[PDB]
Every structure is written in structure tokens, then in C-alpha cells.
Design an enzyme around this catalytic site. Structure first.
Site, PDB file in Angstrom:
ATOM      1  N   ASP A 110       0.783  -1.237   0.000  1.00  0.00           N
ATOM      2  CA  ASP A 110       0.000   0.000   0.000  1.00  0.00           C
ATOM      3  C   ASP A 110       0.814   1.287   0.000  1.00  0.00           C
ATOM      4  O   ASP A 110       0.299   2.363   0.339  1.00  0.00           O
ATOM      5  CB  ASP A 110      -0.980   0.010   1.175  1.00  0.00           C
ATOM      6  CG  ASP A 110      -0.303  -0.214   2.524  1.00  0.00           C
ATOM      7  OD1 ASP A 110      -1.010  -0.649   3.456  1.00  0.00           O
ATOM      8  OD2 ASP A 110       0.912   0.043   2.671  1.00  0.00           O
ATOM      9  N   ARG A 167       1.003   6.832   0.203  1.00  0.00           N
ATOM     10  CA  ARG A 167       0.319   5.803   0.974  1.00  0.00           C
ATOM     11  C   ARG A 167      -1.082   5.738   0.357  1.00  0.00           C
ATOM     12  O   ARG A 167      -1.773   6.760   0.255  1.00  0.00           O
ATOM     13  CB  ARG A 167       0.230   6.217   2.446  1.00  0.00           C
ATOM     14  CG  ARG A 167      -0.603   5.292   3.328  1.00  0.00           C
ATOM     15  CD  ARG A 167      -0.033   3.884   3.390  1.00  0.00           C
ATOM     16  NE  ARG A 167      -0.657   3.089   4.451  1.00  0.00           N
ATOM     17  CZ  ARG A 167      -1.828   2.462   4.345  1.00  0.00           C
ATOM     18  NH1 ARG A 167      -2.526   2.530   3.219  1.00  0.00           N
ATOM     19  NH2 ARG A 167      -2.287   1.736   5.360  1.00  0.00           N
ATOM     20  N   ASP A 187      -5.578  -1.260   3.711  1.00  0.00           N
ATOM     21  CA  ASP A 187      -4.592  -1.787   4.621  1.00  0.00           C
ATOM     22  C   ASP A 187      -4.145  -3.174   4.202  1.00  0.00           C
ATOM     23  O   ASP A 187      -4.931  -4.120   4.271  1.00  0.00           O
ATOM     24  CB  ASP A 187      -5.132  -1.825   6.047  1.00  0.00           C
ATOM     25  CG  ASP A 187      -4.032  -1.674   7.079  1.00  0.00           C
ATOM     26  OD1 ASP A 187      -2.846  -1.692   6.687  1.00  0.00           O
ATOM     27  OD2 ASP A 187      -4.355  -1.535   8.275  1.00  0.00           O
ATOM     28  N   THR A 188      -2.953  -3.245   3.638  1.00  0.00           N
ATOM     29  CA  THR A 188      -2.381  -4.505   3.176  1.00  0.00           C
ATOM     30  C   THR A 188      -1.556  -5.081   4.324  1.00  0.00           C
ATOM     31  O   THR A 188      -1.118  -4.338   5.200  1.00  0.00           O
ATOM     32  CB  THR A 188      -1.436  -4.286   1.975  1.00  0.00           C
ATOM     33  OG1 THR A 188      -0.478  -3.271   2.298  1.00  0.00           O
ATOM     34  CG2 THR A 188      -2.213  -3.867   0.743  1.00  0.00           C
ATOM     35  N   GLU A 218       1.477  -6.387   6.599  1.00  0.00           N
ATOM     36  CA  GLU A 218       2.841  -5.893   6.742  1.00  0.00           C
ATOM     37  C   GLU A 218       3.856  -6.961   6.351  1.00  0.00           C
ATOM     38  O   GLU A 218       3.741  -8.124   6.734  1.00  0.00           O
ATOM     39  CB  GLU A 218       3.089  -5.415   8.173  1.00  0.00           C
ATOM     40  CG  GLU A 218       2.177  -4.283   8.616  1.00  0.00           C
ATOM     41  CD  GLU A 218       2.443  -3.842  10.041  1.00  0.00           C
ATOM     42  OE1 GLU A 218       3.348  -4.418  10.681  1.00  0.00           O
ATOM     43  OE2 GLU A 218       1.747  -2.922  10.519  1.00  0.00           O
ATOM     44  N   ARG A 263       3.811  11.262   3.835  1.00  0.00           N
ATOM     45  CA  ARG A 263       3.437  10.477   2.659  1.00  0.00           C
ATOM     46  C   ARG A 263       2.168  11.029   2.020  1.00  0.00           C
ATOM     47  O   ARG A 263       1.223  11.403   2.723  1.00  0.00           O
ATOM     48  CB  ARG A 263       3.210   9.009   3.031  1.00  0.00           C
ATOM     49  CG  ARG A 263       4.388   8.365   3.728  1.00  0.00           C
ATOM     50  CD  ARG A 263       4.075   6.939   4.111  1.00  0.00           C
ATOM     51  NE  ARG A 263       2.943   6.838   5.024  1.00  0.00           N
ATOM     52  CZ  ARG A 263       2.541   5.699   5.580  1.00  0.00           C
ATOM     53  NH1 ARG A 263       3.181   4.566   5.316  1.00  0.00           N
ATOM     54  NH2 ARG A 263       1.496   5.691   6.388  1.00  0.00           N
TER      55      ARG A 263
END
Ligand SMILES: Cc1cn([C@H]2C[C@H](OP(=O)(O)O)[C@@H](COP(=O)(O)O)O2)c(=O)[nH]c1=O
EC number: 3.1.31.1
Length: 129
Positions: A15, A29, A34-35, A37, A75
Site C-alpha cells: 500500500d 500511501r 490496509d495490506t 505488513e 506520505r
């Protein structure tokens, strides 16, 4: 909302992507997603997906929402498009990301992303398997 041109500099992860925007390099971002980690289940998969989708693109576009354009880490917060296809949406549709982080009045494509998530969940894709 309007799409603006940008140039792929380097992949970072599922992401996050480094892009040249208006002559200045910056980390973006992806909004509303939300991918996992990179490790978490499907993290590498999500990273490979975004990397491939972005690198194979003939044209990369950034689309800021109605609210804040950068987060606390500096970001850029936007919807990224690869050849007209939203990366944020494709990740969620592939079950490689969940809808998350609805902040600073940036929720224009929330419903579109919610629909992609429901379909991926229905299909038991990756994260939802
Ligand atoms: C997607 C998004 C993330 N963030 C912040 C929340 C998280 O801060 P914290 O560091 O407090 O957890 C962080 C999550 O980014 P990553 O998922 O890249 O780690 O980025 C925003 O502030 N606004 C947004 O729109």
C-alpha cells in the site's frame, strides 16, 4: 476529484509506492486500504501485486481526495491509478487488502472499496480464505 500524472520511481510494498509527482520524488500511501505488513499472511503477495500492477502500467495517475493530502509521515494520501485502473480498489477486490483508515475527510471511494471487499470476502479470496 481529478487524476494527475505521476511517474513510478520504485515499489515499496502493498500500500505504499515511491512516485515522482510534479518533479519531486515522494512516497504515496494508498487511501482507504490496509495490506498485510511485510511478516503477516499475504504480505509478500500484496507487495508483489502492487509492484507488478504499477510497473506494468503505461501511465500512473494520482488522485487526491477532498481532505488532507499528506499524513504525519509526509506520505501523499491518494488513490493510485495504473492505466485507468485504481490500485487501491484492485488490491481489495483481490482480497489482498482490507478497507481501513477512514481519515481527514478522505472517503470519496469508501463505498466502491467496501463493495470490492464484500465480493472478495464472498469469493473467499486470499485474506478471506
Ligand atoms: C491510510 C492512512 C494512514 N495513516 C497513518 C495511520 C497510521 O499511523 P501509525 O503509525 O499511528 O499506526 C499509519 C499506517 O500506515 P501503514 O499501514 O503504512 O503502517 O499511517 C493516516 O494518518 N491516514 C491515512 O489515510
Amino acid at each position: 476529484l481529478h487524476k494527475e500524472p505521476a511517474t513510478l520511481i520504485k515499489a515499496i510494498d502493498g500500500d505504499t509506492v515511491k512516485l515522482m509527482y510534479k518533479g519531486q520524488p515522494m512516497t504515496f500511501r494508498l487511501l482507504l486500504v490496509d495490506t498485510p505488513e511485510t511478516v503477516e499472511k499475504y504480505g509478500p503477495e500484496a507487495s508483489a501485486f502492487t509492484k507488478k500492477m504499477d510497473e506494468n502500467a503505461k501511465k500512473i495517475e494520482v488522485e487526491f481526495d477532498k481532505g488532507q493530502r499528506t499524513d504525519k509521515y509526509g506520505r501523499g494520501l491518494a488513490y493510485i491509478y495504473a492505466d485507468g485502473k485504481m490500485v487501491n480498489e484492485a488490491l481489495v477486490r483481490q482480497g489482498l487488502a482490507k478497507v481501513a483508515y477512514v481519515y481527514k475527510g478522505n472517503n470519496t471511494h469508501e463505498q466502491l472499496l467496501r463493495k470490492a471487499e464484500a465480493q472478495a470476502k464472498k469469493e473467499k479470496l486470499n485474506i478471506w480464505s
